[PDB]
Amino acid sequence: SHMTSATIPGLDTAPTNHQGLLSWVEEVAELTQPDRVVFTDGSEEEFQRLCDQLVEAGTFIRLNPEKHKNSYLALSDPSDVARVESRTYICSAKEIDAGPTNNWMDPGEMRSIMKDLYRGCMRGRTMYVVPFCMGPLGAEDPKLGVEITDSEYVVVSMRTMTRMGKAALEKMGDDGFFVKALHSVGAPLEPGQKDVAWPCSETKYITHFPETREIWSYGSGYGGNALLGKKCYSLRIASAMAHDEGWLAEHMLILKLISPENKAYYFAAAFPSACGKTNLAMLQPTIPGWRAETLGDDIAWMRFGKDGRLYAVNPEFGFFGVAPGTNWKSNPNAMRTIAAGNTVFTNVALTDDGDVWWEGLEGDPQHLIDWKGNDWYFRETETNAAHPNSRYCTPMSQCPILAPEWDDPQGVPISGILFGGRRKTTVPLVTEARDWQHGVFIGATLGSEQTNVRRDPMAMLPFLGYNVGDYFQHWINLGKHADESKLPKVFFVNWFRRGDDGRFLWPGFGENSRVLKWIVDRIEHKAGGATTPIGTVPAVEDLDLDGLDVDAADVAAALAVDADEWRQELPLIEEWLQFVGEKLPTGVKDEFDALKERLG
Ligand SMILES: [Mn+2]
């Protein structure tokens, strides 16, 4: 029954221009034994064809086209609802090169385990070969990939999340380099066996081989486990490339802010989860003459341009956002983007009229079907209607405030890099770094509230493709060798400081634009601030609070730098720097010492 690649259907009609790709596809098909092989072209006719099959398989139902044209709801297996960090591996030749923020295993051992799993794993299934491009195709060195997958769901979402298909394949030419990304849901089928809507396995690996730029995923069909451009390529493999090639692959939103001068400023901002970064990516300023547009709300790739400035590009093509919490009052621009359809929803609730719902959304629906397919009732059912990690997957191009520069292969010049976290105490509403190296330290020690303070350096804690210490050194190296006058200024923002009584000291949301105005003015040298031990921090009088009904004492409190509180912060930072291990750069330890000395 085992078939040689040459006789596997679809391989006789395979594209032959690129021999390395073809040989690789043949090797893989020979191992996994799919029923047939399909090279995807990313066309609209292909998209509707795959969707028809997804509807037939029960993976998708078609949402009411009158509310979301060309849109679908998928409900997953309850065991497969999120990225699985403990099953995610960086398999560098040496463990130290994975480092303490990563899960390591010897690459020889990992390959032996996974190749065993892959043997015959696609029996009964179509194997798709999915070419794609991370970033605009017109780029200089475009980052190409090919995902092999046995998941039709994966193919369709990859079409939205990356520039997938014909164009990317042609960009590969006849011998062009590309990231080899392999994926299987690990649910082989017998001939004639009825499949399930959402195949997956209890056994999962999301493995990265940094030296060869390869990704091997098995067992999950969900999000960042299976859409291999999303985190695997965009951050983990890309950070390794960026390390070797002198650029930065980062977990940052990209915001375009326009002043009453009609001058545009571009910012890259890194937050961990639970800091409302999507709200910031799609900011609507509350002060006259200021406007904002978005270039992305997840990944930014930054590279020096001819003029010595850092330019950011969004390597992705779609939004893959967390649904719950998204609503008209807090994020009308996200809702408008979703309203235009072409969206795949995963694990949200279904309304009686074929619309969708999730916790946080307006409407008070009286009855819903929940993410497990069961009846749900307003003010009665005690389980969430949508899964807390449910998703919408939507084209970026239909966002109403998308900046026209979004698809420019050169990217946009970055004036400011922002780091942020949630802190009840200690950390001011906004701080500017003293210089680049201080800024690196500010990013490297990014703290955010956990169940107590979790350190999530540059918001990259679960996403680095190599040693966190070397990563800090890389940041240090890029600044050292740059024109200092051209580097982005670095800031730390905390929208979430609280009074002792638990009040929010800063109203946030749209009012965050007032902080961004200060940031713009600082960049233009048009604003002052206090020189504190932790950096430059504005006083209330430095901020534009005009038109804002707020207690000035609350804003002063949000901006305070208390030396006692920061002396208590020091051993927390010190413990983290020790955890960074032997690769902790001296330049980062220097900034710790300098901060400790300035505090006294
Ligand atoms: Mn993310």
Q: Please spell the DSSP secondary structure of 204-262, one letter per residue.
A: -EEEEETTTTEEEEES--SHHHH-TIIIIIIIIIHHHHHHHHT-EEE--EEEEEE-TT-
Q: How far does the centroid of ligand 1 lie from the alpha carbon of residue 312, in Å?
A: 17
Residues making up the annotated binding site for substrate are 83, 222-224, 273, 389-391
Contact call for residues 585 and 476 (beta carbons, < 8 A): yes
Tell how far CA 193 is from the center of its chain.
37
Residues making up the annotated binding site are 83, 222-224, 231, 251, 273-279, 298, 389-391, 422, 509-512
Tell how far CA 490 is from the center of its chain.
20
H runs (alpha helix) in 445-534:
468-480, 512-523
Over the range 376-395, which residues count as b (16 or more CB within 10 Å of their CB) and which as e? Answer: beeeeeeebbbbebbbbbbb
* Contacts of 107 by beta carbon, 8 Å cutoff, 6+ apart: 91, 92, 93, 209
Among residues 514, 492, 495, the alpha carbon closest in space to that of 290 is found at 514
Q: Could you list the beta-strand ranges (E) of 348-455.
A: 349-351, 356-357, 367-369, 375-377, 391-395, 412-420, 430-432, 447-449, 453-455
Q: How far does the centroid of ligand 1 lie from the alpha carbon of residue 298, in Å?
A: 5
Extract the tokens encoding 400.
């109403």
186 vs 95, 144, 209, 218, CA distance in Å? 28, 25, 20, 6
Residue with tokens 């375009």: 256
Phi-psi region of 505 (alpha: psi -120 to 50; beta: other; left: phi over 0): alpha
- DSSP annotation of 108 reads H
Among residues 314, 285, 559, the alpha carbon closest in space to that of 431 is found at 559
* Contacts of 546 by beta carbon, 8 Å cutoff, 6+ apart: 287
Q: How far does the centroid of ligand 1 lie from the alpha carbon of residue 549, in Å?
A: 33
Breaks in the chain (C–N > 2.5 Å) following residue: 451
Q: How far does the centroid of ligand 1 lie from the alpha carbon of residue 278, in Å?
A: 10
Q: How far does the centroid of ligand 1 lie from the alpha carbon of residue 533, in Å?
A: 31
Contact call for residues 268 and 254 (beta carbons, < 8 A): yes
Side by side, the strands of the sheet bearing 318-322 are 60-62, 72-74, 344-346, 391-395, 318-322
First and final C-alpha spacing in the chain: 76
Among residues 243, 246, 238, the alpha carbon closest in space to that of 304 is found at 246
* Cα 111 from Cα 109, distance rounded (Å): 6
Q: Decide: helix, strand or coil at residue 20.
A: helix
- DSSP annotation of 407 reads G
Q: How far does the centroid of ligand 1 lie from the alpha carbon of residue 251, in Å?
A: 7
* Cα 516 from Cα 496, distance rounded (Å): 16
Pairing state between β 214-218 and 126-134 = unpaired
Catalytic residue (choose from 51, 91, 275, 393):
275
- Residue 275 annotated among the catalytic residues of the structure: yes
* Cα 548 from Cα 544, distance rounded (Å): 9
The resolution, in Å, is 2.2
> Pseudo-torsion of CA 43, 48, 49, 55, nearest 10°?
150
Handedness of CA 391, 396, 402, 407 (dihedral sign): positive
Among residues 238, 236, 185, the alpha carbon closest in space to that of 34 is found at 185
Residue 211 identity (one-letter amino acid)? E
Contact call for residues 205 and 430 (beta carbons, < 8 A): no
* Cα 487 from Cα 266, distance rounded (Å): 13
Phi-psi region of 509 (alpha: psi -120 to 50; beta: other; left: phi over 0): left
Among residues 151, 157, 162, the alpha carbon closest in space to that of 129 is found at 151
Q: How far does the centroid of ligand 1 lie from the alpha carbon of residue 230, in Å?
A: 9
* Cα 235 from Cα 46, distance rounded (Å): 29
Element (H, E) at 156: helix 152-161
* Cα 269 from Cα 418, distance rounded (Å): 4
Residues making up the annotated binding site for GTP are 274-279, 391, 422, 509-512
* Cα 471 from Cα 444, distance rounded (Å): 9
567 vs 232, 468, 533, 564, 573, CA distance in Å? 38, 25, 11, 5, 10
* Contacts of 32 by beta carbon, 8 Å cutoff, 6+ apart: 118, 119, 120, 121, 122, 123, 127, 150, 184
> Pseudo-torsion of CA 127, 129, 132, 138, nearest 10°?
-160
Q: Decide: helix, strand or coil at residue 175.
A: coil
* Cα 489 from Cα 416, distance rounded (Å): 5
Experimental method for this entry?
A: X-ray
* Cα 183 from Cα 74, distance rounded (Å): 19
* Contacts of 299 by beta carbon, 8 Å cutoff, 6+ apart: 234, 235, 249, 250, 251, 252, 314, 315, 316
Among residues 254, 241, 45, 29, the alpha carbon closest in space to that of 145 is found at 241
Which domains, ranges and CATH numbers included, belong to the chain?
7-58+84-246 (3.40.449.10), 59-83+317-400 (2.170.8.10), 247-316+401-600 (3.90.228.20)
* Contacts of 59 by beta carbon, 8 Å cutoff, 6+ apart: 74, 152, 153, 197, 198
Residue 498 identity (one-letter amino acid)? R
